[PDB]
Each structure stands twice: as structure tokens, then as C-alpha cells.
Amino acid sequence: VVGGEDAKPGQFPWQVVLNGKVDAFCGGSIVNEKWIVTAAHCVVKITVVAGEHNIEETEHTEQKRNVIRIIPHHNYNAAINKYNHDIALLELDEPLVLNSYVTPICIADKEYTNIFLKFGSGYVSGWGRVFHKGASALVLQYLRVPLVDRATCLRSTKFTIYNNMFCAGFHEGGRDSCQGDSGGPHVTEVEGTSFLTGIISWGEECAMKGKYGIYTKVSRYVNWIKEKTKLT
């Protein structure tokens, strides 16, 4: 996240970090004790860490888990486009122990997830780069990003943006998601309860004036998430 702020511990208790050959290569969000939702392009052996705050300090709220199953969305096809239908579910080896630092994100039905995205302001968070081609964050970063209208979003890039994606960010640049944040949450706070409204997906140049961050619209996939991650 470029132009964000340090989160306080437990401020985004649904956030997870994905570690592999490189640490903090992507983010994710807790759906429930056994399931994480992330970007399909992020997902090799993956370690999920919930309860994380400072990725260079072994603290006492971290819960590390291994991934036993990867479910990319059935319409995802990286040979066609690495960034279309960019959503996947990760099944953990052993359940997370839910607490103040390890809490699921809420997921509304399709209609309300779309209403919440229409509020026009969401929070993104992650341990991605703090400048374009810069270093990764140590402490979790967060940033409020406004929804960008579709036509502006289309005029900003040569690549095709479908209706299952949205743009968010600032016309002046300086504040955006960045590499390493992909897969993390875009959430909308509704009277003190956060709901998942997007998945951080991609962009071309972090925080560049006239460019925006591209996100997966979660409303299109909530039924699939609820069905795949149901525990009862």
C-alpha cells in the first residue's frame, strides 16, 4: 500500500498474509476458521499467517497454517487472462482459533455486497510495496480508497476491464494498493461491521497520477464463496 498508514494491532483482524519462496507475496481474508479468500493469480507450498502485524517480528497473536486445497473460481483460466475471475479459496490444514486478532470478514448476499460497494468508500490493507517498485511494508498498512466511475476507469488503461472488476483510488495518485497486496481485502464498514466488497487484484504503476487500482467485485462470487466454505 502506497500512501497508507500503519494499522494498529487487531484493526484488520480478517487480514492474512501469504508466504512462499518470497514472504508477503500476497494477502487474503479470513472467511471462517478453515477458509481464506484471495486472488487466483496469487495461487507451490503456501503458508497462511493470521493475526500478523509486523512481518519481521515474531509476536504472540500470529497463527500460521498450511494450505491443503486451492479452489480457483471455476471460470478462472490463467492461460487466457491471469486477472479475470481473479478469486480463489484456500482450505487450511487445521482451524484457526478465532479471537480479537483473528476474526472473519463478513460476507453479505449478492444484493447487499453490491449495495455496500455503492457506498463508494472501502478500506484496503496489506504488506505490499510502500512505493511502486519499492520495499514491502513491515507493519500492516491500510488506506481508504474511493470508488472510481467506470468510464474514468476505462480511459485510464489500455487493458480491458470487465463488469466483474471495479476501480478505486485517487485522481491525483499518491495513494493506492501495490504489488504484494494482491489477494487482500477491500472492505466496506457498515455501522461498525466490515463486509468484503472486493479482492485487491492488479494495477500498472502503483499510485501513479491518472492510474487506478483494479479490484475483483466480490458480489459476483458470494454464492460460490458461501457454498464452498460452508462448515455446517
Binding site: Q11, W14, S100, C106, I107, Y112, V190, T193, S194
Partner: protein, 54 residues
Amino acid sequence: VTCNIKNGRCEQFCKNSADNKVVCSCTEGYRLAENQKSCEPAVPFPCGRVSVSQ
């Protein structure tokens, strides 16, 4: 009093009901409160809530 006006005063979700009334509801882990509008935790660690002192 309709769901299209201030969400029917529902904290989370609203459904239009009979006789120009609404029925509010909440996501998993919350209970609809006695005031008929608010959502109260029904589990120790409900989704989407910041519980650590900020």
C-alpha cells in the same frame, strides 16, 4: 418506512414486509436486537468487528 429509505433504519439488512413495514436482519454471528433494527453479537468473535482497543 421502506428499505430504500435509510435501509429501513436497519443496521445491516432490510426486507420489505406487509402493511408498509420492514423486517431487519443481520449476518451470521449476530442477532437482531429488541429494538428491531440493531445487530448484536451472538457468538464470541463475530465477523467484521474490531474488538481490540484502538
